[PDB]
């Protein structure tokens, strides 16, 4: 959703950070 989401969108790939 968030977190999961971030690294399943590449993680820092995408460009921006983890959410916390």
């Given at each position: 959703?968030?977190?999961?989401?971030?690294?399943?969108?590449?993680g820092?790939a995408?460009?921006?950070?983890?959410?916390?």
């Amino acid at each position: 959703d968030a977190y999961a989401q971030w690294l399943a969108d590449x993680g820092w790939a995408s460009x921006r950070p983890p959410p916390s």
